[PDB]
Amino acid sequence: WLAYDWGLVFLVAAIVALGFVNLGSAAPDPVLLYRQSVALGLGLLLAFLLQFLSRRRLFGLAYPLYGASLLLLALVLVVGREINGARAWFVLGPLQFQPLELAKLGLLLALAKALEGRPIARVWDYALPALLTLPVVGLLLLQPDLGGALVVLFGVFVVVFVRGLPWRHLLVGLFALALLVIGSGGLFGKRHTAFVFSVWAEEWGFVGVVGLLGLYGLLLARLFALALACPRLSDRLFLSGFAGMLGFQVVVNLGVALGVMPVTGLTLPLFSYGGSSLIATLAGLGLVLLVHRDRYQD
Numbered sequence: 001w002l003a004y005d006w007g008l009v010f011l012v013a014a015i016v017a018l019g020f021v022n023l024g025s026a027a028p029d030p031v032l033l034y035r036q037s038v039a040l041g042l043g044l045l046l047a048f049l050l051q052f053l054s055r056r057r058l059f060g061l062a063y064p065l066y067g068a069s070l071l072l073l074a075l076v077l078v079v080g081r082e083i084n085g086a087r088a089w090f091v092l093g094p095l096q097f098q099p100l101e102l103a104k105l106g107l108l109l110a111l112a113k114a115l116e117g118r119p120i121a122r123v124w125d126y127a128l129p130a131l132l133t134l135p136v137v138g139l140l141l142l143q144p145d146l147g148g149a150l151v152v153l154f155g156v157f158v159v160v161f162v163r164g165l166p167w168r169h170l171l172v173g174l175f176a177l178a179l180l181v182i183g184s185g186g187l188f189g190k191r192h193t194a195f196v197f198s199v200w201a202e203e204w205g206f207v208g209v210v211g212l213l214g215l216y217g218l219l220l221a222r223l224f225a226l227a228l229a230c231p232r233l234s235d236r237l238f239l240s241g242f243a244g245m246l247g248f249q250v251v252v253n254l255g256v257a258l259g260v261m262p263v264t265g266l267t268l269p270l271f272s273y274g275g276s277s278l279i280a281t282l283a284g285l286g287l288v289l290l291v292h293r294d295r296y297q298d
């Protein structure tokens, strides 16, 4: 039927097109743009394939996907490939799959589903999110990769806070974990990650950064608007956790790019270089779009 919110689609497409028109000038290379074109193709294809999935099945898979992401996080520690001092990637030749993304989505689904029963015992308000998040954050710290750990923990914080459970301990853990880590016009196109962002910030200047931060602000706004437009509470929680994680990566790259936090492996979603991050962001956006399209169904 295609009863989606096409505004969010246009926002995602606009950020993606900005990322692509920037990469073609921010340290370009004939062979480095092909990888990202194929990543975009795979991402759109996967986000389309996932549209043949009802939300009932998707939340039926809330617990199996969480278990598979836990076991996959455990397995990457044994048979992974070290990159920047941590084994956090599965490399099978041309295939590059990082279990962090599966962990994020599985935990969001699992917590959303397990946290939609309004009455709870007076003890599990602390323990259930604890015992569902701690294995993930711990297996993320054994790599070690604390950027994804921060994203995961902050997502869990957003889910808990929107729900209405104890969240202050989660912020304590979050802040504690984060401590052990050219004009108005610009140039217009005239190897670390932040280079992808430093070239946009310098070749396009204040209008460029204002426009990009505005695109991200509108995306987070539309996500949180779709979140409170769902009758079921599990959907509200899932959408808000996703939007939280996205905004958190964005503000992390903000402080990384402007000399605040030490850099992490967290890219700017839909914008920074990275085929797996692009594909995973597209897949998560496909999930959020399909859970929004099925909001008035049983």
Ligand SMILES: [Cl-]
Pocket: 165, 166, 167, 168, 169
């Ligand atoms: Cl609290």
